[PDB]
């Protein structure tokens, strides 16, 4: 499985995951209303917000988390 690991308006990268993380991850940390940091990259299980400005979201096939 391929993920998005970062993205600029240059392109992307990917990498192919660990051996066990079968899902891409994409992961918004808003920060103010203009601006929110983002990062992208493969995980195991989907990784769960744990704060308030924390968006995730998660997907099963290749660069599926651009």
Not at 22 to 43: E, M, Q
Request: glycine share 4%; charged share 25%; with cysteine.
């Amino acid at each position: 499985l391929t993920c998005v690991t970062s993205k600029s308006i240059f392109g992307i990268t990917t990498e192919n995951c660990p051996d066990g993380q079968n899902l891409c991850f994409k992961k918004w940390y808003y920060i103010v209303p203009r601006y929110s940091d983002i990062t992208w990259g493969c995980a195991a299980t989907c990784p769960k917000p744990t704060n308030v400005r924390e968006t995730i979201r998660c997907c099963e096939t290749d660069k599926c988390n651009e």
